[PDB]
Design brief:
Helix 3 packs antiparallel against helix 5. Strand 1 and strand 2 form a beta hairpin. The protein has 2 domains: 114 residues, Phosphorylase Kinase, domain 1 (2-Layer Sandwich); 198 residues, Transferase(Phosphotransferase) domain 1 (Transferase(Phosphotransferase), domain 1), CATH 1.10.510. The two termini are 16 Å apart. It has 312 residues and is an alpha+beta fold. The longest helix is centred in the middle third of the chain and has 20 residues. The strands form 2 sheets. A 6-stranded antiparallel β-sheet has the order 1-2-3-5-4-8, with no helix packed on it. It has 10 helices and 8 strands. Bound molecules: ligand BI1. The PDB classes it as transferase. Keywords: spine, transferase. It forms a monomeric assembly. The entry is titled "Crystal Structure of the Catalytic Domain of Atypical Protein Kinase C-iota". The protein: Protein kinase C, iota.
């Protein structure tokens, strides 16, 4: 493909690294949100991996219901693009700000779909690592969908463990702070948080930000609402166990079964929801010319094979 066959209908998201356009393929007339990264921003061997990994993941979320698909990938002298599956329900971040706290039930429905999403990921040797309220977008009529893959960890057999200190601070797992090696566990800690945020409307931790924050996370015994349910709390406790091992879903060869097993997920029929057979508790421009001054200075070499159209 190429910019040609597209109708750059709008800009829906502006970043330093990327711009997310709301484009439409003329041929199919269908819509996809395309991700635009200035090539001039991904220089050096440690940035092609940031891309190839986003690519390697996007080459997988296509197979899962709560994970954003990838239509195709093309470049230009000045940049790189991602024709991605499109979503329009918004990010729970917004939905939250417009409602404060969530009924334990609703909250449950979401946390479930995400685990399923996280589970598929893990099973495929992937560590999302960038889970946060504004990353979980809403399906046209409800179902969630994990987004952003610029912090995931590639191929990895269970038992393995990486150690890149990263992720959005408010959700960074305690073992990450301890600089100890880690795995799928950090993804459940994040979920634990995402869940606290939904039901409590608040965050579970609270000199200087990071400085201070990181200490809260590592010593501050989390305060659960005295309005909250027994089951509700329990899960939160389980997921926010500062011990990767003693943590829900973190137990090896049982993790997901554990999760599903937990009382908080008592009447939940996974195989049913995994198929979206459960009802959601809530139904929802030309680019700048190339600057030869810059472009002329690009390697273009470290840009082979970027192109790729999803056959499915
Ligand atoms: C706080 N926000 C809105 C963060 C945007 C998170 N995000 C959404 C998306 C996606 C979509 C968006 C759907 N609405 C958007 C508004 C602004 C930016 C992106 C989107 C979409 O339809 N499909 C997506 O994968 C995305 C893609 C790559 C990296 C990050 C992405």
């Amino acid at each position: 493909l190429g910019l040609q066959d597209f109708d750059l209908l709008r800009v829906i998201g502006r970043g330093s690294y990327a711009k997310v356009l709301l484009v439409r393929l003329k041929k199919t007339d269908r819509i996809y949100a395309m991700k635009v990264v200035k090539k001039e921003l991904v220089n050096d061997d440690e940035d092609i991996d940031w891309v190839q990994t986003e690519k390697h993941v996007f080459e997988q979320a296509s197979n899962h219901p709560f994970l954003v698909g990838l239509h195709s990938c093309f470049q230009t002298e000045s940049r790189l693009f991602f024709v991605i599956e499109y979503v329009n329900g918004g990010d729970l971040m917004f939905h939250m700000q417009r409602q404060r706290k969530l009924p334990e039930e609703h909250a449950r429905f979401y946390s479930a779909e995400i685990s399923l999403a996280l589970n598929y990921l893990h099973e495929r040797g992937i560590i999302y690592r960038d889970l946060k309220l504004d990353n979980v977008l809403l399906d046209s009529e409800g179902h969630i969908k994990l987004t952003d893959y610029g912090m995931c960890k590639e191929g990895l057999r269970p038992g393995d463990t990486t150690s890149t200190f990263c992720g959005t601070p408010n959700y960074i797992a305690p073992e990450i702070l301890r600089g100890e090696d880690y795995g799928f566990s950090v993804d459940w800690w994040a979920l634990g948080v995402l869940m606290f945020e939904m039901m409590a409307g608040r965050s579970p931790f609270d000199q200087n930000t990071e400085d201070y924050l990181f200490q809260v996370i590592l010593e501050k015994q989390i305060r659960i609402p005295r309005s909250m349910s027994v089951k509700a709390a329990s899960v939160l406790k389980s997921f926010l166990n500062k011990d990767p091992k003693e943590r829900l879903g973190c137990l090896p060869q049982t993790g997901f079964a554990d999760i599903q097993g937990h009382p908080f997920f008592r009447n939940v029929d996974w195989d049913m929801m995994e198929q979206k057979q459960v009802v959601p508790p809530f139904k929802p421009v030309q680019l700048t010319p190339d600057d030869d001054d810059i472009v002329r200075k690009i390697d273009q070499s470290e840009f082979e094979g970027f192109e790729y159209i999803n056959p499915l």
